[PDB]
Design a protein around this nucleic acid. Structure first.
Length: 78
DNA sequence: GTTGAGCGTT
């Protein structure tokens, strides 16, 4: 019921990858990877919204090895 | 063709 920000994302990681990964925990409403609009190069972080809340809690309780690097899913500021 | 803590153009 709330967006989770994802930190530590590898540079090459794309939206659908993040989606693909996070889907293994449950249904994913949306996903975002923040990039420079001019180059498309990832800024290293993203966002994700889950349908179920229990799926959201689970994802925060642990770190995430995404494309070779440990990533953190935290509640965002503002 | 580069980097590595952070906080979201629509």
């Amino acid at each position: 019921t709330s967006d989770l920000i994802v930190l530590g994302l590898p540079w090459k990681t794309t939206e659908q990858d993040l989606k693909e990964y996070f889907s293994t925990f449950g249904e994913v409403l949306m996903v975002q990877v923040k990039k420079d609009l001019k180059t498309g190069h990832s800024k290293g972080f993203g966002f994700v919204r889950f349908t179920e809340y229990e799926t959201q809690v689970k994802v925060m309780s642990q770190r995430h090895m995404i494309d070779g690097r440990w990533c953190d899913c935290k509640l965002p500021n503002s």
